[PDB]
Enzyme design. Structure first.
Site, PDB file in Angstrom:
ATOM      1  N   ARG A  72      -6.952   6.748  -7.556  1.00 44.33           N
ATOM      2  CA  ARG A  72      -6.398   6.814  -6.207  1.00 44.33           C
ATOM      3  C   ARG A  72      -5.028   7.472  -6.218  1.00 44.33           C
ATOM      4  NH1 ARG A  72      -4.589   1.907  -5.171  1.00 44.33           N
ATOM      5  NH2 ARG A  72      -4.262   1.713  -7.428  1.00 44.33           N
ATOM      6  N   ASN A  73      -4.237   7.206  -7.256  1.00 49.02           N
ATOM      7  CA  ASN A  73      -2.876   7.711  -7.361  1.00 49.02           C
ATOM      8  C   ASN A  73      -2.765   8.979  -8.205  1.00 49.02           C
ATOM      9  OD1 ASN A  73      -2.295   5.494  -5.804  1.00 49.02           O
ATOM     10  ND2 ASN A  73      -0.877   4.542  -7.264  1.00 49.02           N
ATOM     11  N   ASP A  78       2.983   8.177  -6.243  1.00 46.13           N
ATOM     12  CA  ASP A  78       3.077   6.790  -5.784  1.00 46.13           C
ATOM     13  C   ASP A  78       3.756   5.900  -6.827  1.00 46.13           C
ATOM     14  OD1 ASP A  78       2.167   4.048  -4.511  1.00 46.13           O
ATOM     15  OD2 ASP A  78       1.512   5.586  -3.084  1.00 46.13           O
ATOM     16  N   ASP A 123       1.017   1.069 -11.590  1.00 43.63           N
ATOM     17  CA  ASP A 123      -0.066   1.430 -10.678  1.00 43.63           C
ATOM     18  C   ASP A 123      -0.571   2.840 -10.987  1.00 43.63           C
ATOM     19  OD1 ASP A 123      -1.891   1.049  -8.635  1.00 43.63           O
ATOM     20  OD2 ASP A 123      -0.516   1.753  -7.070  1.00 43.63           O
TER      21      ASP A 123
END
Ligand SMILES: *CCC(=O)Nc1cc(Nc2cc(N3OCC[C@@H]3c3cc(F)cc(F)c3)ncn2)c(OC)cc1N1CCC(N2CCN(C3CC3)CC2)CC1
Length: 295
Positions: A147-148, A161, A143
């Site tokens: 966003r991360n 994350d 991931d």
């Protein structure tokens, strides 16, 4: 076999850190902002806290989420968010450093324009450098997205994350896991179709991530239903060339999004290839107006 990492994890009491403001949240674990005073006194420091809000399936996963974060504390990278501490309440709570300027998507979308030709190129160097450390500690992230990625300073980004992370041991050059709970857009066809995850599956995410930055926080495959990324990818379509990008930059994004993960680029090359472009941003990015200056 190998070497003791002996990276340590501190344990703290629910009374050493209170909960200020609710930052992110939803579905999985929710997250808050707060202050934290260590044992004794000295000084008071800001911090973000993740509490699950109980369940053997729920508790088993958040364990491995924090496990990896400390197992790679080793020397530790400045582009990899280090695990501050942990407190064991009913709802287990995770503590990291607080990144005051949020995340790259929520930061890039805010200054969509007015971002520097260097700043965009540096972040590629930064994100790549950090992922090299993760690649070196035999860890995949799966991931990886804008966003991360968080921003300590406007010229400092980090990765966090590790929720879906997994540590690849000796031998086994791939992994398989939950047949679900996955970000399909940032995912490789080798993974979407066979649930296999190599270090090269993360290379795919890197291309999508930089693409997000160059497109100024735009949504990959907007409107394209998740049910079809398997087909649209095998059909040939990929994210189109960002406006500010030269063939040189978009060529990298395209080389990452090749089907054969074996012909995809390695992270070490990405640092060097992008570190060179940082030395001349105006020749490799066509930003409507440079001259950075103040705000
Ligand atoms: C990209 C979304 C985001 O995270 N924004 C953000 C980030 C920070 N800084 C920060 C984040 C984190 N981490 O969150 C998960 C991973 C990591 C983490 C890891 C842990 F183990 C524990 C933990 F608590 C956190 N760590 C540190 N620092 C931040 O702090 C200032 C704030 C925000 N926000 C941006 C604004 C956004 N919000 C604003 C209003 N708007 C809504 C219309 C109502 C959009 C949402 C809220 C998040």
């Amino acid at each position: 076999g190998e070497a003791p990492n002996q990276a340590l994890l501190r344990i703290l009491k629910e009374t050493e850190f209170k909960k200020i403001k609710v930052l992110g949240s939803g579905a999985f674990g929710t997250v808050y902002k707060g202050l934290w005073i260590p044992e004794g006194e000295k000084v008071k420091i800001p911090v973000a806290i993740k509490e699950l809000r109980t369940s053997p399936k729920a508790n088993k996963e958040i364990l491995d989420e924090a496990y990896v974060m400390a197992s790679v504390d080793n020397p530790g990278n400045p582009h990899v968010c280090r695990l501050l501490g942990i407190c064991l309440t009913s709802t287990v709570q995770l503590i990291t450093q607080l990144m005051p300027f949020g995340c790259l998507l929520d930061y890039v979308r805010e200054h969509k324009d007015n971002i520097g030709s260097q700043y965009l190129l540096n972040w590629c160097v930064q994100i790549a450098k950090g992922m090299n450390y993760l690649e070196d500690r035999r860890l995949v992230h799966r991931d990886l997205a804008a966003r991360n990625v968080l921003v300590k300073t406007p010229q400092h980004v980090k990765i966090t994350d590790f929720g879906l992370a997994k540590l690849l041991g000796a031998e086994e050059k791939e992994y398989h896991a939950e047949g679900g709970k996955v970000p399909i857009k940032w995912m490789a066809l080798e993974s979407i179709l066979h649930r296999i995850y190599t270090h090269q599956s993360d290379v795919w995410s890197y291309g999508v991530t930089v693409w997000e930055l160059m497109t100024f926080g735009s949504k990959p495959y907007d409107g394209i239903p998740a049910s079809e990324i398997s087909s649209i990818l095998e059909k040939g379509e990929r994210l189109p060339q960002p406006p500010i990008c030269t063939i040189d930059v978009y060529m990298i994004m395209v080389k990452c999004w090749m089907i054969d993960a074996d012909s995809r680029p390695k992270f070490r090359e990405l640092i060097i290839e992008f570190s060179k472009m940082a030395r001349d941003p105006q020749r490799y990015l066509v930003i409507q107006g440079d001259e950075r200056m103040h705000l």
